[PDB]
Amino acid sequence: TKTWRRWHRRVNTTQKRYAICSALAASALPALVMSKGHRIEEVPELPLVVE
Amino acid sequence: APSRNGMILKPHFHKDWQQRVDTWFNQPARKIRRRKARQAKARRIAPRPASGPIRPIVRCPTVRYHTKVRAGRGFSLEELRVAGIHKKVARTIGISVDPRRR
Amino acid sequence: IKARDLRGKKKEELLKQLDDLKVELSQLRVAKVTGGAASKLSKIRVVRKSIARVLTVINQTQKENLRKFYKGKKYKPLDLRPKKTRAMRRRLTKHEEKLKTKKQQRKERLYPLRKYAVKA
Amino acid sequence: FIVDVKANKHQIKQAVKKLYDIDVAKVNTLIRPDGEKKAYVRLAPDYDALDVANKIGII
Amino acid sequence: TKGTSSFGKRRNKTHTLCRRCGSKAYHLQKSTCGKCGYPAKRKRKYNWSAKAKRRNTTGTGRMRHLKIVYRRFRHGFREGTTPKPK
Amino acid sequence: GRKRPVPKGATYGKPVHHGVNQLKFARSLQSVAEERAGRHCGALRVLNSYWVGEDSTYKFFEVILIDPFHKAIRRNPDTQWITKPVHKHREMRGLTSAGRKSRGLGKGHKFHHTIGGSRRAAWRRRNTLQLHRYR
Amino acid sequence: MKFNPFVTSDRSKNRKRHFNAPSHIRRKIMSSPLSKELRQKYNVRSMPIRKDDEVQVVRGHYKGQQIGKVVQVYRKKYVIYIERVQREKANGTTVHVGIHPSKVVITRLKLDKDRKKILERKAKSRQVGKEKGK
Amino acid sequence: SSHKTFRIKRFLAKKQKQNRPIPQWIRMKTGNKIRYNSKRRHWRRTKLGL
RNA sequence: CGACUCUUAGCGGUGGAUCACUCGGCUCGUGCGUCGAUGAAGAACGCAGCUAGCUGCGAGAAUUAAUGUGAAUUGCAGGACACAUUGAUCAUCGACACUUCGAACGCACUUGCGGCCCCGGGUUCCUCCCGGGGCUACGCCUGUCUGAGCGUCGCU
RNA sequence: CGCAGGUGCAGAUCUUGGUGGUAGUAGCAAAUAUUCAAACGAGAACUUUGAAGGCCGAAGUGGAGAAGGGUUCCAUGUGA
RNA sequence: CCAUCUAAGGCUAAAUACCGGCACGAGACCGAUAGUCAACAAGUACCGUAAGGGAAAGUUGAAAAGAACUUUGAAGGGAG
RNA sequence: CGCGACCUCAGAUCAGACGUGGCGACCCGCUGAAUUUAAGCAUAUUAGUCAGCGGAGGAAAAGAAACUAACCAGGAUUCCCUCAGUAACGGCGAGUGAACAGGGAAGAGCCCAGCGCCGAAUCCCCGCCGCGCGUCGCGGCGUGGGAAAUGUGGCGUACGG
Ligand SMILES: [Zn+2]
């Protein structure tokens, strides 16, 4: 094994921004959040906003 | 060796290159060290601009680049004289000087 | 015996104490080869460390006196002049390191570095 | 006696005389396979080896 | 004849202990060491033997002076002063 | 010139390396004069040298040496540089004027083999494969 | 969570330091809790165990309310010996059972000038911390 | 041979003194791993570097 | 009937796989970046109450002093430390000490042979014998002393 | 659910370790030779003492050295 | 004809390098036939005249509480 | 043919200093192959690479144009990206192969010799005194030695002085 193996990957900035938008949109759907096992019950609103 | 269509490639791997391989795993480390050097220098010269002396306007010397203007090494002795700044006091004021520019 | 109690003493009584410790240590080594008691064998370590303690005081006092005698002298023994590193002893002294030519001094006086700022 | 390896018969004779107050006729020297030096110190006819040995404590 | 019979004649010694490196590589007739080159002022060392250097490099012995120098460096090689008395 | 020190003139190998007789030393005869003065006078510092004479078999040079521990030298700021440890045996590292001439350094298009400080420095830089983290 | 870049969280490094610590570091490693009454008297939670300290065992086979005296602090073995914590060999003689000081409670500490000094240091430091929090 | 130098004799003296068995109390030391002297040398079996 | 042979299972053994563990490595990164004639690196020989090796140390030898710490070390024994008329242990380490080789340095590498100047003991200025101490290597720089030359000259 | 490999052995006269059958087999056959009794001892063809019969036969199977070995020398004890 | 510089003397920090050294931190790495040859009295044992070559070898148990005592045997070794 | 001076040399256990050896991953100066590829092989390649030698430092080397360019011009060195697998080299085969411009990291400039002016203004050593004094600098004095006119110091170095 050699140290000059490719360890690092570069992703396009537009694709990285795309992934964040998709992650944010999914975080507002309670079905997807419960499918992560996040125990969102008794939570008043899934897009929880506090002062 | 050749198999159907392709490119005639000439890789330069005939010279024991594995002994001289430059890995860049220290690249993030040298960014922090360069950054901390800038911040320490800025504090040490605190009131001074911390970006070096003022450089003159310079025209790039080729047809490809003579429509652009960049920063030069220093103000020439002719423009310093017209402005009325002594060439031995410009460096103390914060004026870069290039005695070899025409 | 304690080193601090040995410092307020003269060289002759320090030599007398050293002699009695060597005589005692010679006696204990005799007991070691003739099947002596375990209490006598354990005293060999004690007497040996007292001889070291006394010889330390004599040598330290002698070296301190030599350092006082050679203080201010232009030439000192190599044992007394400081031992840092061969390379550091080759390097220039602090005075010669800050020596400046008259040309350099004029430059510093006539065109000193200035404290300045540029407004936005 | 067992003596220091860096000790000749003159030093051995003077030392035995100094710390035991006895007169030495002759000294013979040997280096053992252990590595230590052994000295055979014959005393003067006036002195008795058994009496000296009693005072030293070896018997 | 070569073989067991000839080994019976081996009763001399081409090499003796060396007074500089300590190995039994001091040639008696040539008066030189095949391990360190003793009478030569510089020690015998070669880059084709990396194992040989590792056997006899700095750090394989006591380092009587160098280990105190390492300790003394941590305090600026101070000298001539003592800690404050009680 | 430099005769190749091979027994009986036998350089074993390919014909291109068979030369024994018209080979030349890379350094000048003046450089080897400075080197021989420095090696004998280890406690001194070679400063420079110049030509004095010439024969059919010998060349004569005169070398200037500085005792770096004389007080007249290390109390004068204009000559305290020679006392610094980085200036030991300049003649053996090609740092004197005669030594530098053989290194082939300069400015411009005639001197690109040493565009990084030395021939070895330039060779290493253009013979090292740069493998970045993001390739 | 640890933030100091000079403190190691490595398993091997922490275990190595523990297992060949010098004797004076093994002293503070072999600390035991003070009793509730002693923690009330001196504002100190724990002290390094010391010979002639009265302790009781709170874990293991010899747990109980009995108070015993520390007779040996075997710092090399990382154990202490108490008066009554013992068993019988095959021969019939009695040997002490080593107890780790983290499993005992000090009910009375031997008092001397050095012990009073470090009791006061630990109380002063804690009182400063409580005042800072307030 | 009988004819030997001082340097050789001192070398043979040291090898003689270090050819002893391990003491019995070493086995009782806390954290002991030595069971026997693995550097024992017999004159007939193994010869000296000299 | 056995014996013998084959197969399978149980149990027992020549054996040390697998699994679990790891005060070890390997790799990357950071800060420093310091040897030596004031004798280095490396060798040799020694040093513990009982201790061969590893380790530590150098004739004061598994350590002295000093500072910090504050009651142990420990395999057995012995005796400290009364645990302030100030201190076990450990750490740190700026004081002291540091055998023989080794660039290795009086000559020589055999515990060989000197020389000069001093000190002590036998005899008394034989320095004759013994013991101890300081010097006694090469190259080279500035200065110093003593010199050489049918070298260039001056006064004679 | 994804990510990444030093990811699957019957072979390579493969590497390291372990083990069989052979096999209680080959063998313990160069230089003439041993026997009787006693002692110690748990135990004796082999140790020791005594008595017989033999050998080396002074260019020795004798008495001493040089190289080389390095404690193998000597006494006491053990019989792993 | 034009452009450009001023050789054969000298000093100079920073940005750059770092498989040796002194201290540190970490890891999608190996887990005792692996990982450094070396997790252990490892450049050790041992081999070669020498230059040099160069291993194997980790794990009782929480705690030695490491089997007192009886008995057979000369003991190793067994039975309790 | 005595006594001096200078010059060129010599000896000294003369008074003070300095070099040697080690480590060597990184750095500087030399020297320097063949295995290999070319499906053979000699030029070429491997490669100015391995081995050999010398010399250092915490960095080294380089470095303030006898430069680039041909533009509406840039402006010491060093390093990174790109230029560029390009211009070019090569039994023009196998193969090898930079630089300038441009963007960045850092950024810093200076000194003699020479020509001159100034009564050698200069430097080393040794003493004494006032000092100061972490292991050594200052001022004076010296009816104290030496170096230096076969040239020390101050001004001044191409940007002119
Ligand atoms: Zn040698």
CB-based contact E33:E15 (threshold 8 Å):
no
Backbone angles phi, psi at A37, to 5 degrees: 80, 35
B16 contact to strand K (CB, 7 A limit): no
Structure tokens at G23: 């004797």
CB-based contact F103:F116 (threshold 8 Å):
no
Residue of C nearest to D1 (CA): C30
Residue nearest to nucleotide I96 (CA to C1'): C60
* Nearest-angstrom CA–CA distance, D38 and C3: 36
C100 contact to strand L (CB, 7 A limit): no
Q: Which of F50, F36, F25, F35 is nearest to F91 (CA)?
A: F35
Q: Which nucleotide is nearest to E73 (CA to C1')?
A: I34
Q: Which nucleotide is nearest to H14 (CA to C1')?
A: I45
Q: Which of E48, E47, E16 is nearest to E34 (CA)?
A: E16
* Nearest-angstrom CA–CA distance, C86 and B96: 43
CB-based contact E20:E33 (threshold 8 Å):
yes
* Nearest-angstrom CA–CA distance, E68 and C84: 12
Which nucleotides in chain K lie less than 7 Å from some protein C-beta? 4-6, 8-12, 15-27, 29, 37, 40-41, 43-54, 62-68
- Report the SS3 class of residue C32: helix
Nearest CA-CA distance, residue F43 and chain C, Å: 12
Sheet with D24-31: strands ordered across? D2-3, D37-43, D24-31
* Nearest-angstrom CA–CA distance, C106 and F4: 58
H7 contact to strand J (CB, 7 A limit): no
Annotated binding site of E for Zn(2+): 18, 21, 33, 36
Which nucleotides in chain I lie less than 7 Å from some protein C-beta? 22-24, 27-31, 34-46, 48-53, 56-58, 60-79, 83-84, 87, 89-91, 93-98, 101-104, 109-111, 130-132, 139-142
Let me know the angle formed at the C-alpha of B13 by B11 and B18, rounded to the nearest 5 degrees: 145
Whether B47 and C117 lie within 8 Å, measured CB to CB? yes
Q: Which residues of C touch F78 (CB under 8 A)?
A: 101
- The type of residue at C93 is T
Number of neighbouring beta carbons within 10 Å of residue C29: 16
Where does residue G80 rank: exposed (0-12), middle (13-18), buried (19+ CB within 10 A)? buried
- Report the SS3 class of residue E83: coil
Axis crossing angle, helix D9-20 with helix D49-56, rounded to the nearest 10:
70
* Strand K neighbours among E 2-31, CB < 7 A: 10, 14-15, 23-25
